Amino acid sequence: AYLTAANTIIVKLSVAAAAVDGFSSSCNNVFTLFNSSGTARASPFSACTLSTDGLTVTLTTSSWVSTDKLNIRSDQTLLKVLGAANGPSYPALSSATEVSPAITSAHITSPTTIIVPLPVASDLTGSSCSFLVLTAATSNCALSNNGTLLTVTLSGSYTIGDTININALNSALRGTSSTGALYQPVSGATAATIQPTIGAVQVTTSTRLLVTLPAAMSSPVPNPLTADACNAALDLSGKSSPFAACTASGTTLTLDLASAFVPGDRLNVKSTNTALRLGTGASALFFQPLATSPANILNPTFVSAKATSTSVVVVSLPAASTFVKSGSATAGLVKADCDTVLAMSSGSLVGSGNACDLNTTSSSQLIVTLAGTTYAPGQTINVLTTNTMLLAGSSSGPAYQPRTITINPAYLSSDVVATAPDTVVVTLPVTSGLFAADGSSLGSTLTAAQCATVLEVKAGTTAKGLASCSLAGTTLTVKLLGNNSDVYTGGDTFNFKDTNALLLA
């Protein structure tokens, strides 16, 4: 006998059996459920059916308690070996048998995770993981969800078509207590195959998302994915055409959103998935909906950072957010409140006042102050693992998750000087260099088209035509055109451009 769910019992046989008319309506007259002391229960079962191959019996009960036994009442006349017409009745065992919880499906969610649902609340000893049977090696396995969601932490590698099944020597896993029924493998049933499913999610921009995959895909359908293909496979709170475009590379499914990111949504695979599949040939395994009832949450993260001065940083956020502390809505937080929350890669935050502020709570930018002028290129801003005050949307919205960000310098320490009617000399704070997209040094040259993608000189609303950039060491020289309006005028301004990708610090 076996228990494959919270209300199910599957009982197996060794020789094809048969059923007599009315056997679906007289289940209690064939089987009987005992307790550990031999005292039979009172009418435990409700309905029953027999499989076509005749070696399987299905029952539904709600009266099962741990360490209960089963057996066939001897005198029973409604179950016949090899035929209801002519055979004898199916015998009974000298001693009853113990129900043993089973397992029937598992998901490989990420490269290092395999979640296995369990039928009922369970108990385990430590986190050693030899009670299973896997081809690959494992490092750790531990319980969760009140004992109803096993987790297997892969250490080796996943080969397509692998199967998970418990061992017959099990001495670690049990049902409902440390002294309950031992999980056992079903006799005659094949080892269950592992199916893939989507992993974690992260918002990286007001429109982009990144999704972890269980293994490196090689050939979706179509190979170059499309907006139509992705809409038919994934679901985002049931919105119509929630998707703008989608690409796959490595173990990441990069993505775009139809409109602005609305805090709250979740992601799960639709029922009719046909596009995203893992493997090649007849071994292809389609992605399935996850076991967890709540769909995977969308974790907001930092978008980008830049230092407006040596002791100020203005982080940009993907959507409206707000600090929440002790049930109230707040705009900023004092040092110790922001200190176990976000940490610069080197240094410490300000002492007195709001060390981390947003002005109006429902905003999109975050201002940080340090212990003086201590920012130098090569410093990063991150959200720490243990944090709860950061929440996007409302008083109970999603909390931010760790992600490293690099700060772009945006401060000029010294003034900018016009030495001639067509010359402007800009003194940069740190040693610099011109490099290419692929990283090869560009030396000290910059063309007119390449010099308009780095900086601009403007008067009022209009800009000024350029002729050449230049940079040797820490002085960056610029030359205008020189005719009509491309000359120095009575009050002008200089600005770096956010499109800049050629000039590095």
Explain this structure.
With 505 residues, the protein is an all-beta fold. The protein is elongated, with a radius of gyration of 33 Å. It starts with 7 loop residues before the first strand and ends with a strand.
Q: Which features does this protein show?
A:
1 chains, 505 residues, mainly beta, six-stranded antiparallel beta sheet, 3 helices, 47 strands, 3% helix, elongated
The major beta sheet can be summarized as: 7 strands, mixed
- What structural category characterises the helix and strand content? mainly beta
Put simply, the count of helices is 3
Strand element count: 47
Q: Please give the radius of gyration in angstroms.
A: 33 Å
Question: Approximately how much beta-strand content do the residues carry?
Answer: 35-45%
Distance between the termini: 70 Å
Please give the share of residues in helix: under 10%
What's the arrangement of strands in the largest beta sheet?
12-15-17-9-10-14-13
Instruction: Choose one word for the global shape.
Output: elongated
